[PDB]
Amino acid sequence: RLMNNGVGKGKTREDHKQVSDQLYSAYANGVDIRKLVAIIGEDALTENDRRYLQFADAFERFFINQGQQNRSIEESLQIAWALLSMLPQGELKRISKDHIGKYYG
Amino acid sequence: QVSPTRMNLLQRRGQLRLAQKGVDLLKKKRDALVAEFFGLVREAMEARKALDQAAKEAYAALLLAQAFDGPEVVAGAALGVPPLEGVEAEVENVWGSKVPRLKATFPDGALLSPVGTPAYTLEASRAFRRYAEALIRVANTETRLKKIGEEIKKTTRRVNALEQVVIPGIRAQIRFIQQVLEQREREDTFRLKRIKGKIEAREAEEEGGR
């Protein structure tokens, strides 16, 4: 509930709430569309659908499946941006474009 | 929901048992349709290959017929031929599904004034009637293969939907009903211990004071 008070400038990076927002929104849409592909075949669909499919698979393989290495908060946000780097900037509809500019590479 | 009694627990066990039999029933149906799909696919590729051989025959004859004669003679001839109409599609009602099979009408032997001056138009026209034969055979095999494939897809999504939805939903209902009925049983066997304490207190407290 109170992640809103843990994030912010002078506590972490300045985009942490927005990054977690965008990761949850994109991964929720990815698992939504795996639920949809669980009914009809894998062709009657659009392109950013497939982009979210590869994003969900790369998410479950890279962000969560860390083994038991010691990821920081800094390397974890770096992995977060390296996973968000497979989406166009016209689809990250939430976060402010300054943090698009300094990051997303 | 349903108000849980001992009747509805057995009614939901019966509904679960019927759905657990229906999953295996539809898997047997999907197996029979797989057997018929691998039946039809080799017949479809066989008719496709025969269509290819008659295609080589008809295209070589058409090139050579417009080649040795002019293009204008076969052009006026082809614009003279009657349109061969009335070709239509009748019933193949199977799996409760009418698929349209195709048959033609073929005005063929009534040649256009059969004293014909070009000599390679008629042999080419017989070759293209053989071409239309093989084409409608590949057509009414191909659409039947497509229908059986989409019915396999229907059955498969129905099996997966029915299993992975309304087996655990009925399991959740049955577990809810067993928890609440056990809870009612526990309340009543608490009331029995309280009333036994009342009986023994009535016999023991009024022993001394009497």
Curated annotation (Swiss-Prot), chain A:
What are the GO MF terms of this UniProt record?
ATP binding; proton-transporting ATP synthase activity, rotational mechanism
One GO biological process term: proton motive force-driven plasma membrane ATP synthesis
List UniProt keywords, sorted A-Z: ATP synthesis, Hydrogen ion transport, Ion transport, Transport
Q: Where are the disulfide bridges? A: none
Q: Which family does it belong to?
A: Belongs to the ATPase alpha/beta chains family.
Question: In UniProt terms, what function does this protein have?
Answer: Produces ATP from ADP in the presence of a proton gradient across the membrane. The V-type beta chain is a regulatory subunit.
User: Can you name this protein?
Assistant: V-type ATP synthase beta chain
UniProtKB/Swiss-Prot annotation, chain B:
Q: Which family does it belong to?
A: Belongs to the V-ATPase D subunit family.
**Could you tell me the keywords of this UniProt record?**
ATP synthesis, Hydrogen ion transport, Ion transport, Transport
UniProt entry tagged with the keyword ATP-binding: no
Molecular function GO terms recorded: ATP binding; proton-transporting ATP synthase activity, rotational mechanism; proton-transporting ATPase activity, rotational mechanism
Give the signal peptide, or none: none
The species this protein was found in: Thermus thermophilus (strain ATCC 27634 / DSM 579 / HB8)
Q: Which Pfam family name is an example for this entry?
A: ATP-synt_D
User: One GO biological process from the UniProt record?
Assistant: proton motive force-driven plasma membrane ATP synthesis
Function as written in the Swiss-Prot or TrEMBL entry: Produces ATP from ADP in the presence of a proton gradient across the membrane.
Q: Record's superkingdom? A: Bacteria
Gene3D superfamilies reported for this sequence: 1.10.287.3240
Please identify the protein, giving its name as recorded: V-type ATP synthase subunit D
UniProt xrefs under InterPro entries: V_ATPase_D (IPR002699)
